[PDB]
Amino acid sequence: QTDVIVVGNGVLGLSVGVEIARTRPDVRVTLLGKPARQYGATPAAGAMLGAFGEVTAHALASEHGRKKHALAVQAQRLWPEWIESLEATGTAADGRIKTADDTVVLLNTVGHSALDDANFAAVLTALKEANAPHEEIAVESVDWIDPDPNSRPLRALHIEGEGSVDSGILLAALERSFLQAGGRLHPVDATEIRASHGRVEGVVTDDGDFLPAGHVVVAAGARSQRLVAALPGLAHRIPRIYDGVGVSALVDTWDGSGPATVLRTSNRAFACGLHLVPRAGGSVYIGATNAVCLEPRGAASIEETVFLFNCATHQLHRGLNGSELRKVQVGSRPAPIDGFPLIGGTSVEGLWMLSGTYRDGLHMSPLLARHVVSLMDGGTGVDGLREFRPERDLISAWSREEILDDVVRHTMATGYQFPWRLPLEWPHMMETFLQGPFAELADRLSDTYTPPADLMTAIMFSEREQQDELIAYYADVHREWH
Amino acid sequence: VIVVGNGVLGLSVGVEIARTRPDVRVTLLGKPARQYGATPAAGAMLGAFGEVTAHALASEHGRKKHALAVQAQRLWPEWIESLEATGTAADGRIKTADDTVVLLNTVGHSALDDANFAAVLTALKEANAPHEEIAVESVDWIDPDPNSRPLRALHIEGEGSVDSGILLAALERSFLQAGGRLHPVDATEIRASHGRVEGVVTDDGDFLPAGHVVVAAGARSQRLVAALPGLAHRIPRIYDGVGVSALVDTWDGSGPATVLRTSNRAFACGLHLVPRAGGSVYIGATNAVCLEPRGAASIEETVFLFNCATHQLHRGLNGSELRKVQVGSRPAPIDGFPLIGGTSVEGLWMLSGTYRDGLHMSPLLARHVVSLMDGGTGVDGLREFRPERDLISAWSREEILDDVVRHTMATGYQFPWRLPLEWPHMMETFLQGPFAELADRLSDTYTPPADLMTAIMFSEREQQDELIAYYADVHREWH
Amino acid sequence: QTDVIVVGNGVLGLSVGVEIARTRPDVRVTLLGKPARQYGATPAAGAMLGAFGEVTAHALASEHGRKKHALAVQAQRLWPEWIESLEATGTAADGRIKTADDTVVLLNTVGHSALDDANFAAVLTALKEANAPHEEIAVESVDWIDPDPNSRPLRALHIEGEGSVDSGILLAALERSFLQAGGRLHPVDATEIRASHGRVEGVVTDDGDFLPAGHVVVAAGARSQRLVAALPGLAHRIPRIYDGVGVSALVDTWDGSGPATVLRTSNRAFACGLHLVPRAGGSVYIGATNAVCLEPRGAASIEETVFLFNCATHQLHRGLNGSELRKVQVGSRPAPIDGFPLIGGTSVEGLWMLSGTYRDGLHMSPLLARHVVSLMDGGTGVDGLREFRPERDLISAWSREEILDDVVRHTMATGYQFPWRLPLEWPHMMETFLQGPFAELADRLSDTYTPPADLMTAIMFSEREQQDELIAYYADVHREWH
Amino acid sequence: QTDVIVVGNGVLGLSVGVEIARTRPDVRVTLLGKPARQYGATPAAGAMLGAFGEVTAHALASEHGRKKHALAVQAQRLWPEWIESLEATGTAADGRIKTADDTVVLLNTVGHSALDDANFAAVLTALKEANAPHEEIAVESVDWIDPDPNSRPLRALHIEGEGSVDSGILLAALERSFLQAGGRLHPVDATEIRASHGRVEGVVTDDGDFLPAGHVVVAAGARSQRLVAALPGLAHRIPRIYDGVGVSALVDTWDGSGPATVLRTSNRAFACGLHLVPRAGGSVYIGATNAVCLEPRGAASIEETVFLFNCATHQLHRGLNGSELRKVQVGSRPAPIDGFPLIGGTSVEGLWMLSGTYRDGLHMSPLLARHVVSLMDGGTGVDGLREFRPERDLISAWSREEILDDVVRHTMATGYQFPWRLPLEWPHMMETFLQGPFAELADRLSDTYTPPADLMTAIMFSEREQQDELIAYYADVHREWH
Ligand SMILES: Cc1cc2nc3c(=O)[nH]c(=O)nc-3n(C[C@H](O)[C@H](O)[C@H](O)COP(=O)(O)OP(=O)(O)OC[C@H]3O[C@@H](n4cnc5c(N)ncnc54)[C@H](O)[C@@H]3O)c2cc1C
Ligand SMILES: Cc1cc2nc3c(=O)[nH]c(=O)nc-3n(C[C@H](O)[C@H](O)[C@H](O)COP(=O)(O)OP(=O)(O)OC[C@H]3O[C@@H](n4cnc5c(N)ncnc54)[C@H](O)[C@@H]3O)c2cc1C
């Protein structure tokens, strides 16, 4: 069997499917997944082609973070030809994948100085270091925005050639391009990967059928590790992936207008953020919340909807207040337990993984697809992706001290982003009383592993049973790798 | 008989006709989509005493409307029994709560909330209704923000709620069981000649003949009848009272045993939670009178509804899952009172303009119109709400101008805003002039109620001018 | 002539001075203290004749609290004849001591339900138990008030015969009555009490002079214990008194109007509260903040002034916003470390103490004065003031558990009273993270003594050196008494 | 009589007194005014030597505004030698007049974009046009400040050589320098200026005395025009001066620290502003509110104190919250009805006026003093000050349209500066409903004169009788000059 099965119909599954089908016209490539795309991240995405917009001081302070950033900058160079190659299989009436060429990053005071001020400085530095075209511009020169004056930006950064795509039109163009290249869509879900004598045999589907294959590529988003972890030994050799549950919305604007550019803040408390992505036809996309959940969730909370709407109406455009809500969207960012993606080969011959991309899998998709296809054809793919091999000991990209500083800063940032109004002694009081319980949790979980802040807050407020299960997991991983 | 409309009023009258006249063919029009439908967006509360305001009970027309709501409450137990009788256990229960708790908090204007709470208490005592002012600590389930918490609570016995979705299903089933036929199309035009109804042209191009046409098309009811000769200025206009509500799956699957509500608030919105089966709660409900229909919630409406419920009722709703944002059009009559009964056109009847409490009044209104169709006199106090009439003037222009400014200020206090203390008095004084000027400009005789006056104040000049023309044409017709 | 020296020129010193001079024509009575009245509580007081208004659920849950309450109810009965006897020594132009006969207690939502709702219920219960004349009234029937609707009361309680005095006119009338009865005012401060062979010899003054006496009555407010603690053994036998620093203000109202009654809330976080006391001549008194300080402070903080003004303008009358500020007043409530007053005799012959009355020494003054004068004349004074003898082991009126529940409730109440606006998950988060540090502090301070909540918060946020000094103090007290 | 009487003991009276006494050792110069300095602006001032810091877009849009700005830049050059000459008459223990050399202007979002953003741009432009030393600096590089993150600055401007003086030390140094130069201080107030045959005879004082003089210089702050208006015809020939009532405070900082520079915002709603001026000895000055009052007021309102304290603690330093309030200061900025100063000679021989300097008389004092002394000695003084001659038709520096735009913008700015939290439709609603009543008022007051925004808001909210009296005044001025 030289047959290829791609498990997953998100941006990563379809992107790798398209690259395999185009590159190996000799082989049969079958892509699994249903049109409902349950918990799907890609359909809930705007989406921003975020390289520089995703820069944080905390990310760029670690070697693993600087490597992830380098890959995002590399991926940006592939997008123009990738889009051309996908629109080539379609006509004008299919709609345009690209919705904006440029991004404006806004700095307002509706957040923590320790995140927003540091992150704005880090973005400016990363742009200069990469020789990317950009300009700090007068806020008065930013098109379209009409913020509440008390929520308004005082600094603005124009990033040239950092744009957005319509995630729905991208998925349609990938499916069309996949079929054009001879790929076959089988609208069922994989239940189980079959392997024996350290080699893949194929996939059992949820209609009871068995599909044989020499290659299985797992791109099932937040379900990817749970699917592979069933194979012998792999439960403690493939890092867990959780659901980074994200809420976004489509709004029909009061006057049918929209901005010419992406409008965004830097990443904010626990990897949420505020952005507006232009859409065709009098629609705008607003996003996006983030909460790491130990179990999947397919519905927005009241809190998430209110926070998203309140931020957009005050910080971007008060006209959105009177605008019509068309759709609340919910998707699961694949959130890796060690904070880095799972991309490449396994100890099982013919078994590949493309997952754990959290906030920027869609942006990195053309690079990640080409990397995995290179590896499948006996190549070395892309240089900096080696460290993010899916079969690995949990990465420790930061000291426990750095993470404990970060988790307290991010907790305080949930206050400043609201924005709260409190007596002035309360924030210092909460800072001092948060340090102890988070230090105690970190020490209790493991002697070697520390979860990143986004996951640590989820664990802090989870049931005792869920905490104990994670202590067991971390201990089993240490046993396996040490 | 053709019933035009598949809301609570159309189906309720359809069921009563089909059961009462087994000799006649009754056909009910309307689509399963129920576009702009009020009934599916309703909780719904069987609100009689809960709907009492000081402003309503200060007018004779308001006191008449209240009397009818108290009468309607007595019909509900046997009405529900008669609708559930046509179904089985698996169809679910129409009744979702027996009792209501009215909460008084300070997240609103004293001039509405304090006056309205006193008016509810008075109306209960006057009607000898079973009720008790209770300790807030004794209210089950609620977990408000302390700064948004109630300091007074009122338990109303036998004032409850129904599942509006299960009610609609039970009405459709009961209608079919009684020999009614559902034709899922919309009426485009009522046909009449020699002052008598001939039937209805439908939107699939067909013509259905009838000796009787009952218009219960919610907010579309007057626009449908106004096409017939003279009736444009003889049937009071009905606008869309666009309302937003939501279904929430609670964090722990719990819900309150009773309806939880405030009194009616700025421009006939209000905060309430209606129990549902299966770990769901209904939260409602916004209200904005729109001169044109709107089928989607605004961001502002969604945020206001969620913010009020999480702070004033239960902070646990914050972490609860949003299942559905619902939008419907309360039929908002331009003179503030319903359109119920016969026309100058033989066989033409209207059941509409019920705004906030058509669903509660439905069994009474259905029986009234069926009595009239059988040559009876129906219910005594419904005469004044005959659909073919001069616009009612239930309040002085002065009362309405006081009310519209109070309600405008109440939008601030309900937010709740935080302002420099001189700003509210400054806004009160600068609001009075423009609203007095608008009222004087619109007509020398008619004043729109506050809910509609705010919509007109912030409408286009062309829409204002069209209303000046309408009011002038009505005065010409009746004076 | 067998000389008596009263050390202190507040309400308690002058009240006891007047009672001695009137009752004992045989004794020469000299009263020390300067007209500046440094750190003086009495001049900063409104003052309310608070018996029922001062009731809290927490106070009435302890035996010591119920005893203190009984004495406040007894003191109320003495005020009419006491005022008559003080005004008798003056003329019309001296002004009236009594400023109001009745009090209205208001319940609004600008505070914690766990204090304000419980305390309102406790006031209502105490009134019914005492058969005191009172009526729950419609808020619309409360005269004069014009609150912000979002800060308005929804319940109101009229207390008949619970009134107020002008503290300044009371002090003037006491000084005049003291002179009329043959008392002498010596405007210097005591530096040292002289004692040998377990008997008082007299007082060294701060002008270097020595005044001989057979009797010394210490009524020096918050300085009372520090003055007596210099005598042998008494450092660990007289409970420490700290400064309950309070800020109040005199305001000339926009229209010269004022309310006919006292307007107040129940006691709020850390024994502060909101009240308005009527004054003559188009003036109103607004009060009053409270912060226990381990060292004296004679100036208002910005925070205290803003909190007091914000509460009064929103919760009582918006007209106060445009009213003229005449005076910011600061005084030290004598705050006893064990939460109960220091009234009566010492192990030193002729040495008496009248202090540690915290919030209601002025109200209790005629009763306390008569008690101590009775004791000095060989009488038994008033029943049930025995328990508040100044030379004692620290009282433990509450379990450590009760105090730890109270300190967390009061801490949260500082938020609700502001009032803050926070994300809805934050208060529960702060409640859970406050419990641990306060339990840890309580355990560290002593194995037997627990400071009441008002003092525990001050110790929690004091320097490590001040905490260690208090650990030493508590240990030295245990050694002395066990 | 060659005797000179200076009426007023503020910065302008004493500055002109010193210059006359030093320049004319042959003449007797007597300076009137009491040490209480009732309604005195100078003692309530920080004070900033504000030239560029005082720049607004609205001021620099008028020719009269640009002229006033040029004079402020000229005045700055005189300060170093002026201070040297005043300190020369004293000793080390008298303390230093200068308290800072530099100013940092901060831009935060606690205000209207239409004032704060425009004014920050106008300051930057005025600095570049004048070639003045300045630098836009990183906010993180601003020393000492510790703002609430939600109230923090995002832009900062360092202005070199724009500093501050201690107003109290300046007044002491001026009085001492006046005596050293042979001036005599007579601590009484002028009641009446005596003139006949178009020449000054002298001054009747409030102790009933008459002082003869050939020269009377009126520098009585906000009382200056009311004093001269009693002389024949001058009621409608000298523009009215009102009280710009200002509230400031002296604070002892928590740790005795203070900033090395002035910290300020640009001028805000109705010519108030937020600033901190360094002082010696662990004190800081915070200011300053402004409200034009048609009658004098000597006491702060609650509202003014709360606004000043809230702005300083949130926007400058949260440490000020726990800092001790030493003094609330109130003074009357002389607010000319036509918005420009009254400097120079009259139609009455020997009668001079130095007044109506509003926010920057103290800064301009050395220039203004030298101008008037030059004129008295038959010189032409300083070129651009001719236009601000005290005997004039009311200046119309702006169109009625410009003022109506300004008054509505400033009214809305009172909301954004609070800062308020409102439903997003409310500000647009208030903007539209404010325009009509202010247009109606402006049209009713006069067909030719429009009061500037600061005065127009005061007139809008004054009694009908006060409005009618102003209609009469404006009509009488038109009659006199047309
Ligand atoms: C948010 C919200 C909350 C509410 N809460 C309550 C509550 O608590 N208690 C209460 O008593 N009531 C409540 N109501 C509803 C209120 O009682 C209304 O007055 C009542 O539902 C109106 O019923 P109706 O049948 O007249 O109109 P609808 O329910 O609107 O029904 C009219 C129907 O006619 C159809 N139609 C329109 N045009 C045509 C045509 N040409 N031909 C055929 N069909 C047509 C529409 O699609 C619709 O389905 C609420 C309403 C809303 C929107
Ligand atoms: C803001 C505020 C509000 C209050 N409101 C009320 C109220 O509503 N009702 C009420 O009943 N009470 C009220 N009180 C007061 C409370 O009852 C006090 O407990 C009471 O005033 C204590 O009186 P005192 O005479 O013991 O102390 P103080 O009034 O402090 O008098 C002590 C005096 O002794 C002087 N002194 C200090 N050291 C020496 C020395 N060595 N030699 C000589 N003299 C010395 C001090 O300068 C001072 O003048 C309030 C107090 C404050 C601060």
Author numbering:
A (entry chain C), C (entry chain A), D (entry chain B): 10 to 491
B (entry chain D): 13 to 491
What are the paper's exact sentences on this?
Here, we report a noncanonical FAD-dependent enzyme Orf1 that adds a glycine-derived N-formimidoyl group to glycinothricin to form the antibiotic BD-12. X-ray crystallography was used to investigate this complex enzymatic process, which showed Orf1 has two substrate-binding sites that sit 13.5 Å apart unlike canonical FAD-dependent oxidoreductases. One site could accommodate glycine and the other glycinothricin or glycylthricin. The resultant product is no longer sensitive to aminoglycoside-modifying enzymes, a strategy that antibiotic-producing species employ to counter drug resistance in competing species.
To probe the importance of C281, we mutated it to alanine or serine and E426 to Q426 (a residue related to NOS-formation). Biochemical assays confirmed that the both residues and the NOS bridge are essential for the reaction to proceed, as neither one led to the end product (Fig. 2a (iii, iv), d (iv, viii)). In contrast, both C281A and E426Q mutants still exhibited similar glycine oxidation activity, and the R342A lost the glycine oxidation ability but held the same ST-F binding affinity as the wild type. The adduct is stabilized by the Glu426-water dyad through a low barrier H-bond (2.5 Å) and poised for a nucleophilic addition reaction with glycylthricin.
